[PDB]
Amino acid sequence: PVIKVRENEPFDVALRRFKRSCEKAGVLAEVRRREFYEKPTTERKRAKASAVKRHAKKLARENARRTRLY
Amino acid sequence: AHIEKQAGELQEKLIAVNRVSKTVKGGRIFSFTALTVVGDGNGRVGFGYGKAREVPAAIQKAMEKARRNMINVALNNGTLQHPVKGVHTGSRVFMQPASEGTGIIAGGAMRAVLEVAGVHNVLAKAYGSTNPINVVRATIDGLENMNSPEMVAAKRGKSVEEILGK
């Protein structure tokens, strides 16, 4: 999992951000772990789930203008 | 206090008293809690669960909440004709119009909570939890819509009120 997609300009440290798009996730991540059939649909596919903390933050920005904390 | 009826002097019917404390990190809570009903014989919603450090202060706090922001309820002393199918937090009541010639039997304090409410003749046995705190709540949810008509034009009665909104 140095990830086959080549890093822009080659260097001794791999640019792990610039490389992954959908590798390792779900396929080679749960190594030495119990495989489930249908749990992965709700267990791993968490892109909506992780957006909510960013939204919460983008809401509280506005309120800090109205409170005069900002 | 604020919107309350032409009560004159206080009902000071204290229904329960407690003291509650966690003692987990630094001793007890010294405060008491109090449950008090304040009416006037003529129909009120006045009911207060409040709390403060000592028993005199507990009652007066509780009574202050029995007396602020409490609607007038416009019943004929101990008779009521238009009660409500009372629900408050699983504690269920179903009063209905009824004579004052037949009396009221009710255990404990219940004729006394009911007496200052004016709903003592219409009351019929409660259901759900018979926990002393919520069992007495007849006079709150059970009085929100009402009348006690004395008018001869009761049989026109919604009509007269309807043609005025036109």
């Binding site: - | 010294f30 450090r53 000592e54 028993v55 005199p56 202060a57």
Partner: protein, 232 residues
Amino acid sequence: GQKVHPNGIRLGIVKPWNSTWFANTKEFADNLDSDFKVRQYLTKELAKASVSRIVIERPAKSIRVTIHTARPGIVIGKKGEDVEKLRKVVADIAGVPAQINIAEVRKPELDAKLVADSITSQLERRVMFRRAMKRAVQNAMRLGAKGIKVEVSGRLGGAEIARTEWYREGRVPLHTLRADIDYNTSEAHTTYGVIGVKVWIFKGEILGGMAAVEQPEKPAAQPKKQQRKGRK
């Protein structure tokens, strides 16, 4: 149950000592034990009066009692026989003849031992204590001061457990060195044993009832103060 005793660090500045005399080391124990005996046996006689403090003082060839009271007339009794009997026994205990004065009475309703006799009476007399702690506090704050603490112990209601209760209201400093501030711990008996109230009351952060002397050394005494600087 914490703290070095709250009035005890205050004893060197703006709080007076409870006794003031000096004996040159070797006779200091003999004077301290007599100063105790006058405290113990004299107060036994005035049992029926009400009193806030006892202050014992020893000039040359004399012992002066100061006593601080709920009123000026209370210790004197009918036609001064009573106050002579007090001086009689102060003269019998002490290696000298005796003087007694009653002080000027100032804040006797807010004073350390007289406010605590008023509060101890409720517990002594086995009243319900449903409203007591609030009526004690109501009257201290109605007659004066700036803050009060009361702590009551001795198994309230007759209990077979340790049982304490307390009340603080206003301002009550604890680690302050300046002004007099009044504390008393009462001891008293009832049917079931000994009861006791610990009472801090706080009158003011500046109090002039004991204050430093009028002058420094440098302006005081003789007008021509400079030395010859030898020349015997």
